[PDB]
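User: Can you fold this complex?
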Amino acid sequence: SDPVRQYLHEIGQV
Amino acid sequence: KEVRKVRIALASPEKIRSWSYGEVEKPETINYRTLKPERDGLFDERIFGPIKDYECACGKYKRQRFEGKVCERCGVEVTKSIVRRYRMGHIELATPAAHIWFVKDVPSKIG
Amino acid sequence: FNPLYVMAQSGARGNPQQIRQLCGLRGLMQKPSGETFEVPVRSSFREGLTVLEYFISSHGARKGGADTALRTADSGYLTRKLVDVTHEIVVREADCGTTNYISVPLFQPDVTRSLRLRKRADIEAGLYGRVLAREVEVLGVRLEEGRYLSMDDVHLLIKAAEAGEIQEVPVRSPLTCQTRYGVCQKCYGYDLSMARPVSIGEAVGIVAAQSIGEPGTQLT
Amino acid sequence: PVSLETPIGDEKDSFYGDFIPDEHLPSPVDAATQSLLSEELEKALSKLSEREAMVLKLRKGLIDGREHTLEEVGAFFGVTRERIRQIENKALRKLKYHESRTRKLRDFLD
Amino acid sequence: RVDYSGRSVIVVGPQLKLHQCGLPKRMALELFKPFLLKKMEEKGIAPNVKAARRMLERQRDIKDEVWDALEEVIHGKVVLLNRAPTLHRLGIQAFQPVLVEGQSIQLHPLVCEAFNADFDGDQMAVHVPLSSFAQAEARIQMLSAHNLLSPASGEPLAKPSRDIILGLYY
Amino acid sequence: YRAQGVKLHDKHIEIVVRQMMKYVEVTDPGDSRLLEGQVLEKWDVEALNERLIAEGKTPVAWKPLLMGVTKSALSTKSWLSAASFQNTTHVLTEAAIAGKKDELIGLKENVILGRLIPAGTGSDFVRFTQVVDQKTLKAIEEARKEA
Amino acid sequence: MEIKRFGRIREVIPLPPLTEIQVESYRRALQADVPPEKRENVGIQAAFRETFPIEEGLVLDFLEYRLGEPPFPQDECREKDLTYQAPLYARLQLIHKDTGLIKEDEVFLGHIPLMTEDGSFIINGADRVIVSQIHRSPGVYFTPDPARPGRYIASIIPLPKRGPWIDLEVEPNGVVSMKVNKRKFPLVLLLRVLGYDQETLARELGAYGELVQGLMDESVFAMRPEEALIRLFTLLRPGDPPKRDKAVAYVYGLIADPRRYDLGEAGRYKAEEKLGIRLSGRTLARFEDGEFKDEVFLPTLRYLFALTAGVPGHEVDDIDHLGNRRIRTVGELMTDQFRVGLARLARGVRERMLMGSTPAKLVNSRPLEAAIREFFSRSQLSQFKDETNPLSSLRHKRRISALGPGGLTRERAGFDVRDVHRTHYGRICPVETPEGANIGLITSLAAYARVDELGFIRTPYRRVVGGVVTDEVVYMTATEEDRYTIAQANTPLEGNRIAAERVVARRKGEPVIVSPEEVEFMDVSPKQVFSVNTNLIPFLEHDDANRALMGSNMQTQAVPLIRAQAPVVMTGLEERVVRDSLAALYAEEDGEVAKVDGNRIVVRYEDGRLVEYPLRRFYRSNQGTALDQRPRVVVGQRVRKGDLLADGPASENGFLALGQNVLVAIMPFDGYNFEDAIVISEELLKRDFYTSIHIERYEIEARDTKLGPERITRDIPHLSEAALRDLDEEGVVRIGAEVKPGDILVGRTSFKGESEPTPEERLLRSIFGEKARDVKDTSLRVPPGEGGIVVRTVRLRRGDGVELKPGVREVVRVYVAQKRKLQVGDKLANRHGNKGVVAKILPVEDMPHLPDGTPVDVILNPLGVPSRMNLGQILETHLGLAGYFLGQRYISPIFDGAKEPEIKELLAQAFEVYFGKRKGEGFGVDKREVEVLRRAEKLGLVTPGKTPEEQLKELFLQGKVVLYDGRTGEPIEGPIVVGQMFIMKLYHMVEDKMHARSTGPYSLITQQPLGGKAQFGGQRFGEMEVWALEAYGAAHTLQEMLTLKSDDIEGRNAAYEAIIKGEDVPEPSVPESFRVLVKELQALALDVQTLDEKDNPVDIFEGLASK
Amino acid sequence: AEPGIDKLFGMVDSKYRLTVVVAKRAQQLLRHGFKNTVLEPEERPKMQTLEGLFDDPNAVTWAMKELLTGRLVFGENLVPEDRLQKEMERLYPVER
DNA sequence: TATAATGGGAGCTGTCACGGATGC
DNA sequence: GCATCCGTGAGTCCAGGG
Ligand SMILES: [Mg+2]
Ligand SMILES: [Mg+2]
Ligand SMILES: [Mg+2]
Ligand SMILES: [Zn+2]
Ligand SMILES: [Zn+2]
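Assistant: Here's the predicted assembly.
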């Protein structure tokens, strides 16, 4: 829904 | 002839490219000093047509005797300026993108 | 020959409730909930209201103003919708050739005790200008198939109904017309503007939508 | 730049763009004035001979859009550049004489 | 939005005939301008179209025989009057304009009910049908005096009311 | 309307109500390409059923439908008319997928194109009429009679 | 002349300061007079205290602020299109926590607009009013669930944009949900986070039966506050990492952070009164000693369960009661935008605190300045001030809107918010509201009403102790009013004792008959029920409310006249309106007049000081009506404090003068007053009645171009000497010139755009041998239908204390005045809602006239009265007839005024004056008078057998007279009502509205005619106009409207040419806007193809778009 | 009302046909400068200027008054359009 | 061009009928 | 299938705009 929430999640993966 | 019907259909990528007179490659509009259109951007006479009737961008051709001539120095067809209302351009996407009408208008036609 | 009386009686201005408020009494008034308040204003406008009578009057005047305001937009919206369903309907030919029709009744059930004659205006709005779909013989008068009912023909049919000779009148109607994309001249009947058969080419759907929408602001 | 779709006022009634006139396309008045001009010039030109009317038209660009040089109009009519200059000048002399006589082109000059 | 069109405050005209309206001179000059330019050339009032146009441009340049020329321009022609909201077709009706001094449109009493117009400040728009065809449609089909019965009910719609009834009753 | 003293002729309401009953729903496709539950125009399913009866085939069983005025306007055949009304993107989406041809039958479609409307003086029933004076007509008749 | 006044109610108190709702609210917000250390934590001070300190290390803290003097006074701000404002400074100090270093400075924050004396603002030259907003008060509410009949919703509501709306509900499964930001979760969880145990919840709630059981969840009580808190942060922020300090921060910012949640003082007080608790601050919970502590939630749940069960003392709330709706005044509205600007400023501060190596360096004021400017220019409560007349301005400052930021959206507002609630009494006028779709959403403060410190509207009542009415008056909210039995102000008093056995009163709005013993309070005056405008309608008690509303509203639109008069029948409020609106100058103290001028008055006061008062003369209002003050004293005159020194606009000797008193006949007249049209006499023009002065402003700029500079000059190419006759040396029209449509006001030349002349132009130049000039005429000309006398020029050129926006070298403004005589199509009205357009101006010899030869002034139709039911205008006329012959005026207060018998006495006296004059001058009764008496006898209006004189007198006491038709000399066949009436000329003048176009400018994209008289626009032929043409079958007329007359480019050109040649118009082609539609669909990836009957494409673009 | 409007409506099967006939006739009179009129000199519609009485310039007024004489013929497919145009140019030459 | 620096802020409130989409 | 819970687009005309 929120593209920066999504991107912060993807980044918290690594 | 005479108009009797009006059809509406999906336009294919190839149909869209056939409409286009040029790809718009730069997000520029007009030059901040000359107030003339920047090359390969959203107002380019090279793509969308001349701003003045029967006159290329640089000035080498300025009469209706040349008609359909594409000037060699600037690249601008010599026709009526009215064509800046009619000539499409296009943006070639690096990756395909969905047309939201076919996504969000429920139920989704793609879905 | 009193001014208020002559204006009301002649139809020039004024109705009996407005006159009554002038010379009789203002009357009962509603609360903001819409329920009527127990005590009425007993003075007329000539005598003059009190502060409290005037304040309580406010609630109903404001409800009616807000009514009027909201209803002019609702009416216009309705008219737009009606124009959009009907705009293509046009008188496209003289006669579609249908044998179908409708029957307009002259009587309606009461207390369900019996049948009684419908009101005159209701019969006129159902029959005036219509084309007879079948021969009718009443009071020794032949009303032939294919005839446009004039207003005198309507009154004749009402008399026949009072004398017992007829209960329903078969009539060509847009409901039963078989013209594609429109209506025919027989099935539509008379151009009420002109008291004569409708001309082929009349934009009869637009006229219907406007006829229905234009009094919308009067519906309370 | 400011947006053409900037709201003017409280409602969504109107936008700044609504008030911007097209200055580019000729008005119906301007188009008709240009047309009456072309027709009056052709009328006044028909009072000259075919050659002086034609020389004026080639030299002013009223034919193919461009004004030819004296050498080109001369080579076209088979005649010296001086000769074509002299027949242009007598064509103008005739136009001016008629125009002073009838005052039929004055109002187009602004 | 549309050319050859105007609006103004409306005022009752009792002396009008049913097929007439009162149209202010200055509005009529602007609404009919090309016709007037032509007709002025057709007389000596200006050599040509463009002289005539410059003449009408300034108000203190406007002569007198121009009003006479205008009167010949509108002869037998009709304008369309419109009062919004246009709820049924009789919100638009055709009228032969009579030129008046003043800046108000003069409206005939018997068409007020159909326009739902009265004179507590209403305004109306006016429009010029241009071609022979539009003008013929307006004079045959849309003339006030050819539209007397309601298309909704068949009953008279142009009909006595208020003072007219009051005097006849009296 | 009667309650308010408004006299309104029934046939206007009947015109509208006829448009509300325009559509039907298929109950059995018969020998047709149609589907069960498909909604289409009563006119069209009747034309198809007579084409199938003339062809000796089984006709399509269908039930009548009632639509409100809004839905009936949106369901109309002409995509220019429906898209000018409401739900523009939905209308245009389905018309584009189907490749719809608007035949310019009604009034809205022709108004949008700036065409002469098929009503009144634009009706095909009257617009081809000719006028000629007695003298000119007689002269044309002499011209004909020579050849 | 003599003023006789009626009525027996003596008002204990005068009206309060009628603009205090503006003035006091803004003074409270700015605290400009208060020494900094004494300020309260309210207004912009409170904004500062919420923003600062700014932490994270570095800290930037607030000490105090200061407001300096305005750089320009008010008139200069109007003249130069400036904002009247004061510089804002703040003293700030930067502390580094570890170093201990402290840097302190006074930083400049921009400017704050100042309120003028009358309560308005000057934003970029134009006067503006911030209109107060009405909204639901913050607090705790309980309302019926519209779905489940026995269940109730609880609603916790903070100040707007100061927290979320929280709802509690009892779910059909019995668990009590909480909804915030549209998230239905079980409340038990939050209760646990607060620190509540099942023991405390059992002992505190079990009384209400099984309800408490839907609250008991063991999986919740089995978790400590930390685990519940993390659980809530997860089900509130899906995907956000459930970090502990992040969950604390979020819930604290949601429920406990005063800088983010605020019930306001009003929401605090009402939540406390409703729930019967005490609040520490203004938030739902606190963070104390590392844990959350409840304030509101458990009391709210307690109440909700008690209401659901049925236990007494628990009731649902009426959300439209004026104890639950409050007023946000200008001070609060502005403070909120100030708080937003300060929040953005603080974000910039924290940003520069990260990136950097001083308070000034850290502070960028721009966001703050942007927010204030945004409030004062583009807000819906920031309104162009209406100053048509001075009452207009006063009324504008007292308006109340339910719209605006944080309010209602029209087209959605239901019937409830628009209703007049019982509690509006004495608070909000019940008649004065708009007639369009905004009806009931914009309102006016009642004359005696006051907005209290919390924002609730209070009205005054007198105390009654054992039947005695005291002079103690008490201002109450509607909640307090509901406690008492309150008597009506017309209750008969003998001295101070209620002299009646039965008393009309109200209990909670309900009318009730009551003994004197039971009376606790009594209204101050009928005046307190109505707005100021409604309080100016005499005989209001005889006017149906619907037309009273119109008379109210139209007083706002009255034009100030050059010979304005106060009404002959007044209500007694006219002087106070002139006073409170600053529509006049008054003496400051006792004194003597030393100098008197058209321009100024010098007064010598008792102190010996010599005070000079400049008079504003022919100034331009926001609406172009004329603001000028005229002296009403003379040299040597002795003045006491408060005496009138000068009349402003619509002021006659200090009385509100909104129109003229004219002699009126009520009768039909030949169709010319049909359907509310009005007939008037040419006499009115002859004596400049209804003449008004209007001033228009025109403006022109000369700027630098890339093509060379625009110049304001007299040397304009191709113009005659006649065209330049009245242009000054520099090319500006001279003061006093008469300018008509077409005439130049400011000459200007612009360099031409680079163009190769068309060959026709080359040839025409050669024929006349004239070099085309290099500049063209771009002058400012008087537009169509305008003109007048030039009365001022202003000339601001760069290089001169003058600096303009970049690239403009000079601005010129020309002021033009017109005297506007009444004309056909102008709108007249009276205070009872009778309104009409002038349809006919008759010469005097055509006017109906009295036997003594006096013609009447205006003829109003009787058909306008019966269905309108506004009989006040008839009584006014009757009393006007009396006043006409007695040379007197009257004050008839509303609901306390002249009654028919007293009017009849006055008409008997006036008759003696009107008729005994004749009987003395040597004349008897006329034959025509005898014919009219014969008819009157048959109408029942006169007693048969009495003499001519006695019957004429009976008619006169009915307010009727014999009247002669000026065209015939024959009498009107019945006697006619004649009298003086107060009639205003409204600001709807046909001079401003008439407009026509043949051709003109077209729009850029659509190529359709522009809209608007100033753009020389065309009329909209909309969807419904099209339907009308379709229904007539007028196919070609319609096709013209859609093509040749709008956006068919070749069609419009060719039709113009054909007409000017006398040919017929050509056949239309495609409108341009359909081409635009096709291209806009092609951009949507749709291929829209015009086919022919063989299904082959047809190109509507004539090849110009195909490669 | 237009003079004779009730008879004009009597002549046609559809009111819109009268408007088509009237408009086409008006265009024909304008095209040929009124030389093709079926009116006799005393039947010509007149307009009162200040100078005196002259021909009414309005071709729709003319066309209606001509229709009312029975001297016009109207209907569909009377003559091919180009033959009609060319014969009217022959009988009544257009101004140049 | 090199000390080291590693997951964001904003919300926001008095409508309504209706077609399609999710839980029972 | 049968209800509920959602999104979404809609709301007379003109005028001027600060
Ligand atoms: Mg009105
Ligand atoms: Mg209003
Ligand atoms: Mg408004
Ligand atoms: Zn080039
Ligand atoms: Zn049929």
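The longest strand of chain F covers residues 23-28. Strands of chain F lie at 23-28, 39-41, 61-64, 101-102, 130-133.
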